[PDB]
């Protein structure tokens, strides 16, 4: 499962991914409602799911 970042995200905690519009994240799992782990540029971290759109 993959998603595309729709909006920039500047991390608030060191375990969160920095997101730029157009990044493609490989989705891992839900940590809590609204926050998922995924991988981006060989880094695993958390990201807010309302920032992305799930791809086909």
């Amino acid at each position: 499962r993959q998603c595309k970042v729709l909006f920039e995200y500047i991390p608030q905690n060191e375990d969160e991914l920095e997101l730029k519009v157009g990044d493609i994240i490989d989705i891992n799992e839900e940590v809590e409602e609204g926050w998922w782990s995924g991988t981006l540029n060989n880094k695993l971290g958390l990201f807010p799911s309302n920032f992305v759109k799930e791809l086909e």
Binding site: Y9, Q12, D15, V31, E33, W35, S37, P48, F51
Partner: peptide, 13 residues
């Protein structure tokens, strides 16, 4: 409008 990140409570287990 840009989105607001949800609150966090948990680290990855």
């Amino acid at each position: 409008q840009p989105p607001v990140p949800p609150p966090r409570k948990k680290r990855i287990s």
